[PDB]
Every structure is written in C-alpha cells, then in structure tokens.
C-alpha positions in Angstrom: -25.5 -39.0 -130.7 -22.0 -37.5 -130.9 -21.1 -39.9 -133.7 -24.2 -39.5 -135.8 -23.0 -37.3 -138.6 -19.6 -39.0 -138.9 -21.3 -42.4 -139.0 -23.5 -41.4 -141.9 -20.6 -40.0 -143.8 -18.5 -43.1 -143.3 -21.3 -45.5 -144.2 -22.2 -43.3 -147.2 -18.6 -43.7 -148.3 -18.9 -47.5 -148.1 -22.3 -47.6 -149.8 -21.0 -45.6 -152.8 -17.5 -47.0 -153.1 -17.7 -50.7 -152.2 -19.4 -53.4 -154.3 -22.6 -54.7 -152.7 -21.9 -58.4 -152.2 -18.8 -57.8 -150.2 -17.6 -60.2 -147.5 -17.1 -59.3 -143.8 -13.3 -59.4 -144.4 -13.7 -57.0 -147.4 -15.9 -54.7 -145.4 -13.4 -54.7 -142.5 -10.6 -53.7 -144.8 -12.7 -50.9 -146.3 -13.8 -49.7 -142.9 -10.2 -49.4 -141.7 -9.3 -47.2 -144.8 -12.5 -45.2 -145.1 -11.8 -42.5 -142.5 -9.0 -41.2 -144.7 -11.5 -40.2 -147.4 -13.8 -38.2 -145.2 -13.2 -34.4 -145.0 -10.2 -33.6 -142.9 -12.2 -32.2 -139.9 -13.8 -35.6 -139.3 -10.6 -37.8 -139.5 -9.8 -38.4 -135.9 -13.5 -38.6 -134.9 -14.0 -41.2 -137.7 -11.1 -43.2 -136.3 -12.6 -43.1 -132.8 -16.0 -44.1 -134.2 -14.7 -47.1 -136.1 -12.7 -48.2 -133.0 -15.7 -48.0 -130.7 -18.3 -49.5 -133.2 -16.3 -51.8 -135.4 -17.8 -55.2 -134.3 -21.4 -54.0 -134.7 -20.6 -52.2 -137.9 -19.3 -55.4 -139.6 -22.3 -57.4 -138.5 -24.8 -54.9 -139.9 -22.9 -53.7 -143.0 -22.8 -57.2 -144.5 -26.6 -57.0 -144.5 -27.2 -53.3 -145.4 -25.3 -50.2 -146.3 -28.0 -47.5 -146.0 -26.4 -44.8 -144.0 -29.5 -43.5 -142.1 -30.6 -47.0 -141.2 -27.2 -48.4 -140.2 -26.4 -45.4 -138.0 -29.8 -45.7 -136.3 -29.7 -49.4 -135.7 -26.2 -49.4 -134.2 -27.1 -46.6 -131.8 -24.9 -43.8 -133.3 -28.0 -41.7 -134.3 -30.7 -41.4 -131.6 
C-alpha cells in the first residue's frame, strides 16, 4: 500500500487534465509528464510508481480514470 496516496494523486491529475477519449499513446505521454505536476514531496515516489505500474496503468486508464477505482484495481491501494 506504499504507493496508494501517490497513485490517487497522479490518476486524479490525469482525470482532471486529460480529455476522456484519449488513446493509449496519449495516456502514456501524459503519464510520463504527470509526476512533475504533483507536489514536490511526491516527485521521486511518483516516478517510481509510474515505472513499476506503467503497463497495468495504461491498460486500465484507457477504460477508466476514477482515482479510487484505478488505484484499487491495479493493487496500489489495498
């Protein structure tokens, strides 16, 4: 559960700032810039999270951007 809070912040950033019909390629590009917009204390943790969860993130985010649900389903929030 160490990545739960950062997961919800990052998915929250995507939910708010990315248009909803986005392609996997567009989600990937946004994911790999998103960490820089979180509060500074989360930056390196966010980078680590994206690195470790990026495949599963793309597969789920193309379907749904709800932070709570996404973070639960990928296993970041238990």
